[PDB]
Amino acid sequence: LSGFVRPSPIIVSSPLSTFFRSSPEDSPIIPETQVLHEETTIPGTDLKLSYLSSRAAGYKSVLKITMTQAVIPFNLMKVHLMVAVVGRLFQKWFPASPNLAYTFIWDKTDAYNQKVYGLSEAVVSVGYEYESCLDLTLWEKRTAVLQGYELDASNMGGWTLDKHHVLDVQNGILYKGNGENQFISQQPPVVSSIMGNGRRRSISCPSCNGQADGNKLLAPVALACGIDGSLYVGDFNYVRRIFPSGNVTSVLELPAHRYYLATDPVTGDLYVSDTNTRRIYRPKSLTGAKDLTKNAEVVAGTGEQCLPFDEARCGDGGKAVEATLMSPKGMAIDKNGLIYFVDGTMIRKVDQNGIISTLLGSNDLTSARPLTCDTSMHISQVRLEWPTDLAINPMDNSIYVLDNNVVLQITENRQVRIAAGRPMHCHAVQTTLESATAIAVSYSGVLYITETDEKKINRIRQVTTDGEISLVAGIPSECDCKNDANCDCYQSGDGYAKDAKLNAPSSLAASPDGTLYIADLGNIRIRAVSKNKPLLNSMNFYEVASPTDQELYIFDINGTHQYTVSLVTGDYLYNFSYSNDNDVTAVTDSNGNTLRIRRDPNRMPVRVVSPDNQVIWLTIGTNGCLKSMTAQGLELVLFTYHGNSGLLATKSDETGWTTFFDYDSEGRLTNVTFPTGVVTNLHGDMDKAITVDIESSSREEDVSITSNLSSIDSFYTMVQDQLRNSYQIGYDGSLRIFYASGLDSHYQTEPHVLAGTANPTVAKRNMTLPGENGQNLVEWRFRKEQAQGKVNVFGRKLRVNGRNLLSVDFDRTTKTEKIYDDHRKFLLRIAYDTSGHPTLWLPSSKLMAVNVTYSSTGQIASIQRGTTSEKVDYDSQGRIVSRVFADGKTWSYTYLEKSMVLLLHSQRQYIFEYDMWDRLSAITMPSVARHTMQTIRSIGYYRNIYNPPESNASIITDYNEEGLLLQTAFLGTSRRVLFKYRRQTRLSEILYDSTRVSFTYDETAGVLKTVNLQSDGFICTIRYRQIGPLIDRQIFRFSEDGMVNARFDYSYDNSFRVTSMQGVINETPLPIDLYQFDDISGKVEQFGKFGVIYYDINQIISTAVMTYTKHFDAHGRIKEIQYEIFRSLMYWITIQYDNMGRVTKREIKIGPFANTTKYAYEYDVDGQLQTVYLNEKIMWRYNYDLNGNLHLLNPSSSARLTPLRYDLRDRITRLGDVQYRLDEDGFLRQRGTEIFEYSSKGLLTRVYSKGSGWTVIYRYDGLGRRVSSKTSLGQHLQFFYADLTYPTRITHVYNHSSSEITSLYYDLQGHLFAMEISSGDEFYIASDNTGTPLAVFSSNGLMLKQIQYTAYGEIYFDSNVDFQLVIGFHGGLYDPLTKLIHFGERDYDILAGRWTTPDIEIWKRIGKDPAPFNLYMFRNNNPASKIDVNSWLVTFGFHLHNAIPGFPVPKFDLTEPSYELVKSQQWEDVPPIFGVQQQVARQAKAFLSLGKGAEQSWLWFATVKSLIGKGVMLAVSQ
Ligand SMILES: *[C@@H]1O[C@H](CO)[C@@H](O)[C@H](O)[C@H]1NC(C)=O
Ligand SMILES: *[C@@H]1O[C@H](CO)[C@@H](O)[C@H](O)[C@H]1NC(C)=O
Ligand SMILES: *[C@@H]1O[C@H](CO)[C@@H](O)[C@H](O)[C@H]1NC(C)=O
Ligand SMILES: *[C@@H]1O[C@H](CO)[C@@H](O)[C@H](O)[C@H]1NC(C)=O
Ligand SMILES: *[C@@H]1O[C@H](CO)[C@@H](O)[C@H](O)[C@H]1NC(C)=O
C-alpha cells in the first residue's frame, strides 16, 4: 500500500486581541482584529474606562478553512471536512471544486450552550477521499487556538474600567483593564528544578524513600510521563516513582547502562526497556515490595539473545513471553494498548495478547533505497537507521521514530512521511539536525528534539504540527561543559527556557498538563519546562507585575484584584474593596481618592461616587449592557448597539460628534464614519496571511496590512503602495522592527527581579542603522538587595555601549533614593513621601534643598528652593484658590459658577468662561475685551474659531480627525495657508496665495526627500541625504542671481552623536569641526576649537588665551560670567537674584581699566520690570495699562515721558510722535514711512519705505525660516543653518557686499561667545545672561565695540557703528534699519516693546495654567531674566541627548521653530495610524523613562452645538 501521497490543508486562525492605543485619546481604530478601542473619563479622577469589542458577544472567532489552490489531483473528488471543538462537532461534506473554501464562524460557545473562557484549542480534521482506493481516506489533523469570551472584569455592561484587573488563573491570561490581554500561557516557558542538586550520591542509597527536593542523585538517564503525573526516573539502578506530592519512593533494582522507560496512558503500569538484561519488564508493586530485584515481571526476551538479522523470527508468531530478543531500546504503547518496542534495529509489535508481530521491520534488501525526501513509501519496504526512541501522538495515532536525526512519522495509512529533519541524502524538514539523542511529543502534536553535542549546544528545538522548528529550551552556551568540567553549566535557575543553560539533556517526557521534564546529567537535576504560571507567595497571592506602568499587582485566591503596588518602591497605591460576590465597588488611592461605585441587586452599577463627591448616573439596555453615562445636567456620552450583538454601533459625545460604526456577522469593524464626513473602508479577507485594507475616504493612502502569524513570532506587515513596515513581535515581547528606512531596532526581554518569570521587561535596546557605525547599545542592570522577606535596596544602572552612566540605587530603609555616578561628581538624594511622592531633593556641592510637600487631596502644596518658595490652597475639587509667593505677592483664583476670575494684588480681573471639560469658551480682560471662541464640525475638518473683540477677522485652525493641522487663515485680509497630504500621512504641499512648498518622500527609505518652495522666479529647493533616518548631507540650491548655494557634510562615531561638521558655502569649503564628547557622563569635552572643563557646577569654556568662565549660584542658575583675555581682566558681570529668581543687581565692569557700570532692577508687586537704575541714578520707568499695555516709558537716550495709546484689541497705535498700524488681522501694517508686507504664515516678507526711501525684502524658505535679507541701501545678507540638534540656531551668515562668511559658535546654554569670519578673521564675544552681545573683542583683546543696552535692548551707547552684528537682543536676529528683532517665528519690536505677530497656540498654553498674559507680551514683561522641575541632569552637566537617542534635548532658547519644521526632523515616529505602532510607542516611552480636565486631539476651544446635531451621521466618501 504505497503511492498515495498525503493531503495539503491550508488553515488560518484569527489573530489575538493584544493591540490597543497607548495614550487612548488619539486613535480609536486598530485594524489588527478590527477591534474598536474607546476611552472615556470619570470626572475628578484620571481613572478612565475602556471599550474593547473583543469582549462583545458578536465578536465571533473565524477559522478560515480553504482546501485547494485548484491543484486537486485527478483521483480525488470528495471532501469529508470535520471540526472538533470543546464539544461542538461540525461536519460538512463537499464535492471537490477548484478553489473551494469554507469559513467556520465559531460562536465561542460549547454545544451545551456554555460560555467558554480563556484559551481553547479546537482540532481541525481535514479529510479527503480517493477514487483509487475508496475505502482508504485521508486524515491530516491540526490544531488552532481560538479566543473564548474574555472574563467579565467589573460588569460595566460590557465596558471595562481602566486600572481594574482580572486574572484567568485557569487558562493563564491576565485580562488588563486598559485594553491589554497579557496571555501568561503564551509566554516563553519556565524552568523549575524539582529534584536535587548537582552533587552525587553512592550506590547503596540511604534515605531512599522519603521526599526528594534536595535529594542527591546518581545518574538520571531516563524519564517517563504518566496519567497520574508520576515521573518515573531512571537513576542508573533505581526506578523512582515521584508522586504528585512531596514523597518519592523507589521501585526497581538493577549505553547499555542507559535503559529507557515507557508509560501506558490507559493503565497505570510501568514499562522498562532494559537493554543490558535483554528483557522487557513490568513491576508488581509501584509503592514497593520487599526486594527491588524480584519486583519485575518479564514480558519478552528471556535474557537470551536472538538472531541478528534473519527475516524468519527471533521467536515471532508464537508467544511474546517465550521469544528472545537482541539489544532492546526505547519504546511506547498505543492508546489501543499495543506496545511497540525497538529491538535490534527495527520496530517490533506486540498486541493485547502475548504475540510478537511486525508492522515495519528491517533487512529488506529489495528496498535498500535512499531516504525518500518528498513523499511516502511502502509499509514493508523501508530501511531503518538507529531508531533508539519512540513517542506517539494520540491525536492521529501517529508513530514518531527517531531515524538518524530525522523523525520519520508512521500514521494509520501504513505510510512513512518525513515529519521533521532532513538527512545527508538531501521549515523543520528543510533544516538538518545534530546529536538528536531523545524525542517526545505532547498532546497537541508538538515534537521535542533535544540536541546535545555537549560542546556549546545543549538545547531542545521543538517541531510543531506544521513541520517548522523553533528553539524553545536550551540557550546556546559559550562555555564548554566537556573539557571545562569545572565550569558552572548551571545558570539562571527559575529563569526563562530560552535563557536557561543546559548540560547534556538525556530524556524527555510530556505530561498531560504540558510540563516537559528534562533529565540533565551535567548538573544532576530534573528541570521542568512547564507552562507559565502566575506565582503564589507565602501569603497565597498572585504577584503579577508589568513595568509598562512600573507596577506590581497582587491578587486574591480566585485571582481578582486587591491592591496595586508601585514596583520600584514597594509602597502601596490602591485599595479595592468588594461586594460579597467579589465584584469591585470602591477604590482608595494613597491620598484617599475614593472612586466608589454601588450596584444593583442584579450586580449592575447605577451611580458612580467620585472622590470630589460627584455622582455619575448610568443606565442599562435591553441586552443587559450600558447605553449612556450621565452626570449632573448634561448627558456626557451616548452609546447604542446592533441589537443583541454587544457591538458598539453609535458613539455620541456631549456635543454632537455622533460617529456610526458598521460590522459584519463575524465581528469586524469595516466602516467608521466621522461626522466631519471622512469615513473609512476596511476590506477584511483571509489568505496565506490575514489581510486588511483600510481606505481613508479623504486621502488615497490605502494601507495593505498582512499578518504572517508563525509559531516563532507574529511578523506583521504595513504597506503603503511602496513603503513596507513590518514588526517582529515575540511571545515574550521581543520587539524588533523592519522600517523601510533601513532602521532595524530590536528590543529584548528580561524577567523582573522582584516579579519573576511571569513578567517580560525591556532592559536592552539594540538598534541598527543601514551603515557602518549604526550600532547603539543601551542597557539596564536590575538588582535588588534582599533582606528578610522584603526588598531593601533596589538598584538599577543605565549603560550605553559598555559603561555606566547613572547609578539609580533606590533604598527602602528610610524610603530615600540616591541617584549618582561612580565618579563622585553627581549626587542627588531624594527623600520620598509615605504616599509614594518625591518630597525633598538634596543635591550637593553648593546647591539648595528643595522640599516639596503635597496636598491632602493628592496634588502639590508648596515648592521651596531654600528662600524662593510659593504656597497654594485648594477646594474640594482640587482647584487652586490662592497662589501666594515668597516675595509677598499673592494671586486669587476667585472662581464663579463654572468660570474663573483671576485677581492679582493690583485688581486685574481675568474672566474666563469654561466648558464641562474645562476648555476655553470666552476670555474677558480687565477691560471689556471679550475673546469669544468656538469649535465647530464642518465638511471634512474641524474649525477652531477665535474671535477678537468687535471683529469678523477670525483666525481659524483646521484639523483632521487624527489631529494634523490643515488650514490656518487670517480672515481680515482673507489670506490663508493650505496643506496637502501625500501617501505617508504627513505634510507635503504648503499653499498660500503664490507659494507652493512641495515636499516629497523617498520610495525605498521613506525619509524627507525634497523641500522645494516655488513662489516666483525665485526657486527655493532643499534636498537631504541620510544614514537611515539621521541626516548626513543637506543641499541648498537656489536659482536667482545674487543668492548662493550651500551644502553640508556630517560624520558619526558609534552613536547618534554629530561628530564632525564640514560644509561648503558658495563653492568655499570650511575647516572641519571637532565635537569631542564625553560618553562616560554625557558631557561635552570640546567643540569647534574651544575646550570645556567642568568644576562641579561650573564651566570654563577656555582656549590657550581666551577664557570664558561661569560661576553658577546656589540655586542652579547663572550668577557670575567672568571673562579674561591674555589672563587679564576684560569683562565680568555679577547677577544676584531676589526671592523670585529675577535679576536684581548687575555690576557690568566692561572694559579693561575703564569705569565700572552697574544696575538695579526695581520690580513691582505685579512682577515686572517697572523702573531701572543706572549706577547712581534712576534712569528708566515703565507704566502699564489695564491689559498689560506699556503706555508710558523713558526712551533710549532722552529723558522724556513718551506716551503710548492702545485700542480694544491691545493693538499698538502710537509711540510718542510716530503712529503705528497693527491692522484688522493683527499684522503690523505701517510704522511711520515704513509699510510692511507680512505673509500668510504670519511672517514678515517685504518692508518698503515711502518717505525715507529704502526697501528691505526677506526671502524665506518653505520651513518658515529666514534665508536672505536684502536692503536697498546695499546690505545684502543670506543665512545658512548648519545645526540639526538645534535646527533654528543659525551658524553661518553670507554677506553679498563683501563676499565673506561669518561662522558662529555658541556656548553650552546657547549664548553667543565667538565669531570667526571665513575670510580669515576672529572675534571673542562676551555675552550676558539674556544671550545678547555686549562686548566685541579681537584676538588681541582690544575692545572693538561696546554696547550698553536698555531694559528692552535697544542701543543708547555705541563705540563703533560700522561693525554691526546680525544677532542682537536675546539672541534673535537684529536689524538696525527695520528696528525689528526677528526671533524664530515672531518678530519683536525694540521701539514698541511688544510683539508684532499675535500668537495662536498661546491659548493652548494658557488654557492649562492661567497667568498674567497678553497677546503681545514679551517674556511676561520680565526682559532680563531666564530660568520648577527641581532637579535636572543638565545642571550637573549630564547632557544625555548625545548618549541616549530618542531623548528630548533641553530647549534653552526663545527662538521657536515652525510647525512644518517640527515635522521635518520627525523622521518616521508619526502620530500613530495602526495598532502595532501603538505597542512600539509604549516600549520606547517606558524604556526612555528615567525618573519615577484632560484633553483631546487638538480640540482647543469649547464645543459648539453645531448644525450636525446629536444623533445624525454625515458622511463623505471621496
Ligand atoms: C472565591 O474564593 C472563595 C474561597 O477563596 C470561594 O469559596 C468562591 O467560590 C470563589 N468564587 C467566588 C465567585 O466568590
Ligand atoms: C462599508 O462601506 C462601503 C462603502 O461605503 C459599503 O459598500 C459597505 O456596504 C459598507 N458595509 C457596511 C457593513 O456598512
Ligand atoms: C544587535 O543587532 C545586530 C544586527 O541587528 C547584531 O549584529 C548585534 O550582534 C546585536 N547586538 C546585541 C548586543 O544584541
Ligand atoms: C523644608 O526643610 C526645612 C529644613 O530643610 C524644614 O525646616 C521645613 O519644615 C521643610 N518643609 C517642608 C514643607 O518639608
Ligand atoms: C557686510 O559687508 C559690508 C561691507 O562694508 C560691511 O559694512 C558689513 O558690516 C558686513 N555685514 C556683516 C554682517 O558682516
Residue numbers in the entry: 965 to 1218, 1229 to 1400, 1412 to 2412, 2421 to 2485, 2497 to 2522
What does the paper say about this structure?
The Teneurin extracellular region defines its adhesive specificity and controls both homophilic and heterophilic trans interactions across the synapse. Eight sub-domains, of which five were previously unreported, form an intricate structure centred on a spiraling YD-repeat shell domain.
Here we reveal a conserved and surprisingly compact domain arrangement for the ~200 kDa C terminus of chicken Ten2 (Ten2CT, residues 955–2802) and mouse Ten3 (Ten3CT, residues 846–2715). Comparison of the two structures reveals a structurally conserved core fold with two flexibly attached domains. We designate this the ‘plug’ domain, as it resides inside the shell cavity, acting to ‘seal’ its N-terminal side. In support of this hypothesis, both the ABD and the Tox-GHH are mobile and not resolved in the cryo-EM structure of Ten3CT. The residues downstream of the Rhs-associated core (residues 2467–2592 in Ten2CT and 2382–2508 in Ten3CT) are located within the shell itself. The auto-proteolytic motif found in the bacterial toxins is only partially conserved in Teneurins, which is consistent with our data showing that neither Ten2CT nor Ten3CT are cleaved at this position. Our own structural data support a model of NHL-NHL mediated trans interactions involving, at least in part, an alternatively spliced loop of the NHL domain. This is substantiated by recent results suggesting that inclusion of this alternatively spliced loop in Ten3 enables Ten3 homophilic interactions in trans.
